[PDB]
Amino acid sequence: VQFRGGTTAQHATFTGAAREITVDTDKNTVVVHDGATAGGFPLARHDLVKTAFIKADKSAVAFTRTGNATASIKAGTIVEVNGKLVQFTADTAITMPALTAGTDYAIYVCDDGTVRADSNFSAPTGYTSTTARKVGGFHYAPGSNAAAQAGGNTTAQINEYSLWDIKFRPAALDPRGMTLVAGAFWADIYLLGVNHLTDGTSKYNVTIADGSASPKKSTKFGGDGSAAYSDGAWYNFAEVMTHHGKRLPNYNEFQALAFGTTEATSSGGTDVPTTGVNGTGATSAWNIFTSKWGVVQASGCLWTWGNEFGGVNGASEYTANTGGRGSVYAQPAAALFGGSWHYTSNSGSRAAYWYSGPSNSPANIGARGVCDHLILE
């Protein structure tokens, strides 16, 4: 059976009988008729709804944490994948792989109707990137989020605030290793590592970048992938955050992201070399410093450079201290937040130090990234 049809031009002056259907041969679609409206009512090609992703509540993430190792996709979620509609009319359990402390996972909605997580961010095992659509993810943390203001524990579990989907996520290109702070913005769970080019800025159990162990030079600003910065100046850490679509925190962001840590407490000992791990000679375990949002080593471990200036100024004369990129005049200090291991009761979620100019590079200053919260219709 071949239906009556014609071009779009031929349809423009044609009024079909009520409930008559024709085919527009220019568009390769069906046109429904009502006995009254010239041109009828063309229907949409599936191609024009490719990547559709519809949630019942667009103001919240698409998933719910249901236990330390379990999560569900929410009722009312509709997903286009591989030419098909896949929907969930009730909260539906996500099939989990083996979960390993300090690892990010991607959540996929597949064309067989299943929803599943995997450590692989291209495709889950058993599927391809065609039959399985990445719609979100989460961080399986090495310990709990802070229930109050005494840090968390060392029981590996899903961080509820690290749940993201394609329309509810970090603005930064790579959403991995980040957590949503009070619903307002995203923070890196871990302090910046030396090998951030391959690891991203936020990775568990890696060597922390600071004034002595400088980060690798950004490949967007002349770096070759191997060379590190000559030192850990503010300029270099800011440049690295920019590379990854992030920034250093301001004071309002820092107090928010670090809330839940054990206040007026520092790591002790002589160093904090590694993310998510006890410091060298530490008197407090790493988990003492976990925030409400699951930010790890949120205070009392390393200072983070901030994206704010103020406090004491440098000399009122042109000073070439920017790594060969011009001079500064009356340069104010760049903020440092959080305290570090040797600062005893001065560390905390509002600890702030404004004496150090941006060219300074001591062993107890590193960085933590933040970015905007991206919500989409």
**Contacts with Mg ion, residue ranges (CB under 5 A):** 309-310
Residue 329 burial by Cβ neighbours in a 10 Å radius (0-12, 13-18, 19+): exposed
CA 175 to each of CA 120, 121, 186, 271, 331: distance values in angstroms, whole numbers, following the listed order:
14, 11, 9, 29, 34
Residue whose C-alpha is closest to residue 338's, from 280, 286, 264, 268? 264
Q: Which does 347 bind (CB under 5 to 8 A by kind): Mg ion, a copy of itself, none?
A: a copy of itself
Q: Which does 226 bind (CB under 5 to 8 A by kind): Mg ion, a copy of itself, none?
A: none
Quote the tokens at residue 138: 């989460």
Amino acid letter for position 233: A
Counting contacts by CB under 8 A, is residue 17 touching a copy of itself? yes
219, 241 in Cβ contact below 8 A?
no
- Measured from the CB atom, the residue of 3 and 128 that comes closer to a copy of itself is 3
Counting contacts by CB under 8 A, is residue 227 touching a copy of itself? no
Binder to a copy of itself among 7, 9, 38, 43 (CB under 8 A)? 43
64, 136 in Cβ contact below 8 A?
no
Q: By CB under 8 A, what part of segment 248-267 binds a copy of itself?
A: 248, 250-252, 255-256, 259, 263-264
Task: Please report where in the chains the tokens 């080593």 appear, as a residue.
Answer: 297
What's the closest the beta carbon of residue 309 comes to Mg ion, in angstroms? 4
- Measured from the CB atom, the residue of 48 and 98 that comes closer to a copy of itself is 48
**What is the C-alpha to C-alpha distance for residues 355 and 334, in angstroms, rounded to an integer?**
8
Number of shown-chain residues binding a copy of itself (CB under 8 A): 120
Q: By CB under 8 A, what part of segment 273-302 binds a copy of itself?
A: 292, 299
Q: By CB under 8 A, what part of segment 71-130 binds a copy of itself?
A: 78, 80, 83-85, 87
Counting contacts by CB under 8 A, is residue 50 touching a copy of itself? yes
Quote the tokens at residue 345: 């009761």
Q: Do β-strands 303-313 and 365-366 pair in parallel, antiparallel, or remain unpaired?
A: parallel
Counting contacts by CB under 8 A, is residue 318 touching a copy of itself? yes
User: How far apart are the two ends of the chain, measured CA to CA in Å?
Assistant: 41
Binder to a copy of itself among 7, 9, 10, 26 (CB under 8 A)? 26
Binder to a copy of itself among 63, 105, 190, 353 (CB under 8 A)? 353
